[PDB]
Design a protein around this ligand. Structure first.
Ligand SMILES: *[C@@H]1O[C@H](CO)[C@@H](O[C@@H]2O[C@H](CO)[C@@H](O)[C@H](O)[C@H]2NC(C)=O)[C@H](O)[C@H]1NC(C)=O
Ligand SMILES: *[C@@H]1O[C@H](CO)[C@@H](O)[C@H](O)[C@H]1NC(C)=O
Ligand SMILES: *[C@@H]1O[C@H](CO)[C@@H](O)[C@H](O)[C@H]1NC(C)=O
Ligand SMILES: *[C@@H]1O[C@H](CO)[C@@H](O)[C@H](O)[C@H]1NC(C)=O
Ligand SMILES: *[C@@H]1O[C@H](CO)[C@@H](O)[C@H](O)[C@H]1NC(C)=O
Lengths: 318, 171, 171, 318, 169, 319
């Protein structure tokens, strides 16, 4: 008479690593590194904005691509690869910093500068580079000031915007750089051009400069965009001789949101907290090997294809 | 390491799908097999606790510091590449260590639950049985099917069979 | 896990306040309780070994990289935020692994010190006692108070009671 | 006749986490994460300077609020929340880098520039914006140069500071940006203004940006500051036309110390190596959850209120 | 921790130089020391497994100029971050060695107990323990009988009846 | 008749740390932190370039010290402690980013701009500050343009560089800041000076500025250097009337390579993947205490002399 003690085993064991063994066979194991992600931006439960071909900078100055995206509210803001900021070709000072501020925002409210110009100024300069509805147009949030009478000196002008609101305002402007002495004379006169800008927390001077350049969107002339934050109760003033691209409106960035850059289409029936440019990651696992660039609440990225965690005893077959 | 699961027990039993740990008995009226519920649940409950710990991570919200679609200033970019790579090296290392350490413990835990079942049976048998080197107990009295069940059941009374058992051992 | 604590031992003794591990005895004269010094100290020493490692304080000096009272540039500000949160996620994770791992081993080590004490007694008694499965040894001669102190003081000579014990065990 | 082995238990156990079990009852445990700090700044053993309402930038240029902090030696420098850097409107280019150098420093020395000015110059100008002891005054370490003779061109002027020391010296200067063209002509004449700053390692040019129209708009009178380090044996030269606010002293930053931004009151009885916005942290514990922003020798911040480390065995009561 | 090393065994044998774990015996013929190959190999192989993990081995580039000035604010970010990384690796390095050393010692202790246990179940009713790691054998066991204990060729039932008469009288 | 079980021991053990014990004696142990290194640059298997006293910025503009480093292919680029960037004193905007870019590169190719100037311009200006064969010279890859006729107004001038290649090009130019009004008038005339540079992707403009400054290499004058990348198929146009230091060649940075700042001597017979200011680190060990600042593939740096890993059982010698 006999009674025997034993443990189960399986025909197919799983190999796992241990402190003392590279190749240790156990009854069962599971993955701890996620390798699969969702090819959509899972947006259910998020007030989200897909910018499409609107670049975040474009929202502020109102490039035609961005007409659907000039005001709004969102907790998630999606930026896309084909994104357009500029129709009249140009560049922006500290552009990445500005883009990051926008991409962190919870929305944008627009507010008139209230700027008015006298009879000497034509403030409706438009161009073929900025088509709006089959017709020549310009940045929606800016006005291209030029001499009403061609070749005449642009008048000495002062414009002041007061932030009478209780939160900070972001205001942008441009400095026109003509592409020929002839073009510059027609627009602003033969006089020396000076544009000077100032608040309690900004002072700068700009001088339009003529120069031959390659055509971008058909234009050899450029616009240099600048920006600063105007604090509550402060006033900002522009003194200009010609060449200022004045703000018709200023921006208020509201609250907070999560900025995402991605290739993936949105799925609004899908819920997620982790994003990468391929889409979303939904997993209970602590690690992942999909991408080292992720946004939101995510498992940590690791340089391993697989990490097997044993869920059973040593497997010893018959 | 405890002496059992890859040790004095020769191998596992592919035949026992009933549980992780079990009994096999041979007695006058044929042979039989039954899994011990307490011990397997002891091991399994511990495994699920490890798994709970692994997925129970609530999380910090990170924002982007690298532009996917536009270029970044070169020096800040290089600082960012260096930092992110340093963080990844740490996480890869921690992930490798957690799983190696955790697997070593899991194995030695399951081996422990096995030894404990074996010891529990041994004390229960007292002087009525002896150990062969493998996991078997050679029992020195006639042990009934109901009697075998009494050993698994933890109900078996050694005193009841002791005289017969002691006599058989000595003679 | 070793067998003893939360194991074949049914429960702890609240009454015993002079040590971690102990003896309880039953004889013709009554009932006694004493604590084993070496085994509890062996356990306390290992814990304080752990506590010493914890409060180990060789520390790096850090200086501020974000201003409390003024704005910092937006891009570098975001990089510092990403970096600090990454460092914090790592430390938070390590603090949890540290205590979870540590606690596991502390519980198990205490169990082992108990088993070792139990094993030491088993080997002393030799053929003069049998174990009841609950942490008690049934002694097959009479053990007066001095004889009990003999077992706890590790001075019990089994061959002094062997003859008697063997025939009480067998009859 | 029996001898029984067992272990102690306690009436009230403490719950701790393990690899296999959350909620595991054990006889005893201690806290690994410090959750309480001291709401004072502990300065025992530290030779320290409490800047009070003086901002570190003000130390270098001599704002009236900083009159008692123009020079010093310290281990520890403490900065307070609404500290004053400026008495006259304006700002410092590159301010955060500079503030960090001062807050990393172990003291400051002032060395006279030795600058001397011709008959044509009035260097004694003061403003009612910088009141000192109830009188119109100016930044102590700088001089406001204007034409001694109003409306007349400020003479072409050269000044050089030579560092004859064996350590680098920090030099600061100001640029006056006038409120209107009328104000600029009076101070400096009708000429074009240029300010040139040249050393062996550094070069730059500045033009005052004249504001306009009311004093209540954004383009009004300000002084903006610039700085650089002058190497040992190297000379730095100012070539200027009007608009330069010139240093009468330069600064030497000495040794190293620990800079603390906090509003906690100084306790000289108490000793510490870790500080944060709201006080000190004196703990032996490896972790803390007080603040993610600390300086000095600090336990590592963790996002947990409590991590209990068992100091006893499993508690198994009857 | 397992009973044996620094436990019920009083000490190690410097004399044993062909193994970590071994047998010492006394009988009518004389005394002998033989190391045990299997228990010794199992411990060592576990140790070499740790060492393999240890030496298992990202490319980094410079973000901190050795020979030129570095803009001050970014310099402080770089110093903070690098020191924060170094504190983590230093801490990890200390945790690794401490935890691995604790385990290494106990695994060694483990293999010893496992050797002891194998012999016990092997000797069965023929011998009894002295509590210091020895088995007093109650029969006459010559060097071949001893090699039989080390080989695992020992048939307890061969000496049982004699050994039991000796254990009972 | 009895048989005994035992473990070995050694006379001299080593002490290691554990979770419970900081002074635990074990039979054997081994190091986990590398402590020695090699005081040379181990360059075996690496196609490398030692810049010597050439600074990497000097490769792009052609400072004389860099004459043997104007073009190349390397997988490893080495920079030395007091290397020379400028013969004619000045500085470069965003210099550290440009230096890091060169030090990541696997080589450099030079491409001529093909720039040509009219008769009223002298493009061959030279200085005492830049010397070859002990005589006055200039940056090899730039041209100092001045009025051929002294004191005359420098003519309004346009120059365009066209990138007809498939990869981006790095173009550098200088803006001359004269020491004095008289010097400025002689070189360029009395007219107001303006330089504008424009491509599809870049726009900037510069004004030469006159100021008194200390002498560096004998000159109180300065050249500020500027750079941009020019994309494939794009053109960059310079509009200038005095003060431009015009590019005669552009740079193309090729592939990828490892950059090292060190004063250690090259050792061509030993190989390595980890480097620091003093030589190299070759170890199987996972941690080192040699240096916090390393490049390549390195053990992680730790603030510890020694961490001993137990390679043996507990040591319990005979009393
Ligand atoms: C700083 O200026 C002083 C004078 O302005 C320069 O020193 C003179 O140097 C020459 C050359 O050695 C000596 O012959 C004179 O005796 C020195 N004069 C004095 C009073 O020092 C010095 O070279 C300048 N430093 C720099 C870096 O330009
Ligand atoms: C394998 O592991 C998974 C998760 O641990 C579990 O769901 C499953 O039951 C295990 N399978 C076996 C063979 O037990
Ligand atoms: C580049 O120059 C060539 C030659 O003039 C010209 O064909 C081309 O249009 C220019 N490219 C751009 C983008 O302007
Ligand atoms: C802003 O303008 C308003 C109206 O002139 C004035 O009341 C206020 O003082 C100005 N703000 C500042 C800070 O000058
Ligand atoms: C000790 O161990 C090290 C590494 O494990 C080895 O190189 C050496 O040969 C061993 N030496 C002894 C046995 O002392």
């Amino acid at each position: 008479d006999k009674i025997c003690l034993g443990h189960h085993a399986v025909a197919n064991g799983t190999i796992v690593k241990t402190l003392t063994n590279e190749q240790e066979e156990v009854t069962n194991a599971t993955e701890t590194v996620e390798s699969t992600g969702i090819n959509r931006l899972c947006m259910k439960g998020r007030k989200h904005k897909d910018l499409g071909n609107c670049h975040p900078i474009g929202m502020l100055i109102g490039t035609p691509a961005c007409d659907l995206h000039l005001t709004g509210m969102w907790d998630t803001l999606i930026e896309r690869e084909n994104a357009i900021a500029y129709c009249y070709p140009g560049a922006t000072v500290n552009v990445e910093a500005l883009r990051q501020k926008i991409m962190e925002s919870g929305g944008i409210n627009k507010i008139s500068t209230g700027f008015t110009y006298g009879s000497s100024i034509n403030s409706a300069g438009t161009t073929r580079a900025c088509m709006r509805n089959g017709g020549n147009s310009f940045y929606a949030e800016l006005k291209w000031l030029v001499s009403k009478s061609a070749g005449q000196n642009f008048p000495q002008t002062t414009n002041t915007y007061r932030n009478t609101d209780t939160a900070e305002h972001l205001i942008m402007w441009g400095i026109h750089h003509p592409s020929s002495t002839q073009e510059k004379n027609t627009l602003y006169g033969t006089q020396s051009l000076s544009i000077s800008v100032g608040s309690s927390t900004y002072r700068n001077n700009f001088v339009p400069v003529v120069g031959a350049r390659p055509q971008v969107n058909g234009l050899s002339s450029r616009i240099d965009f600048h920006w600063t934050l105007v604090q509550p109760g402060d006033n900002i003033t522009f003194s200009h001789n010609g060449g200022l691209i004045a703000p018709s409106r200023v921006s208020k960035l509201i609250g907070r949101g999560l900025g995402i850059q991605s290739d993936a289409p949105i799925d609004n029936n899908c819920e997620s907290k982790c994003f990468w440019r391929g889409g979303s990651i939904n997993t209970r696992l602590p690690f992942q090997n999909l991408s080292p660039r992720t946004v939101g609440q995510c498992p940590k990225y690791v340089n391993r294809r697989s990490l097997m965690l044993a869920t059973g005893m040593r497997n010893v077959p018959e | 390491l405890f002496g059992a699961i890859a040790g004095f027990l020769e191998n596992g039993w592919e035949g026992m799908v009933d549980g992780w740990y079990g009994f096999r008995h041979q007695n006058a009226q044929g042979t039989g097999q039954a899994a011990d519920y307490k011990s397997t649940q002891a091991a399994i409950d511990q495994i699920t606790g490890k798994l709970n710990r692994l997925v129970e991570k609530t999380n910090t919200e990170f924002e982007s510091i690298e532009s996917e679609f536009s270029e970044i200033e070169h020096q800040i970019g290089n600082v960012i590449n260096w930092t992110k790579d340093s963080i990844t090296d740490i996480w890869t290392y921690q992930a490798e260590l957690l799983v190696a350490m955790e697997n070593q413990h899991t194995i030695d835990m399951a081996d422990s639950e096995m030894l404990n079942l074996y010891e529990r049976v041994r004390k229960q048998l007292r002087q009525n049985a002896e150990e062969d080197g493998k996991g078997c107990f050679e029992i020195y009295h006639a042990c009934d099917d109901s009697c075998m069940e009494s050993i698994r059941n933890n109900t078996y009374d050694h005193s009841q069979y002791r005289e017969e058992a002691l006599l058989n051992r000595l003679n």
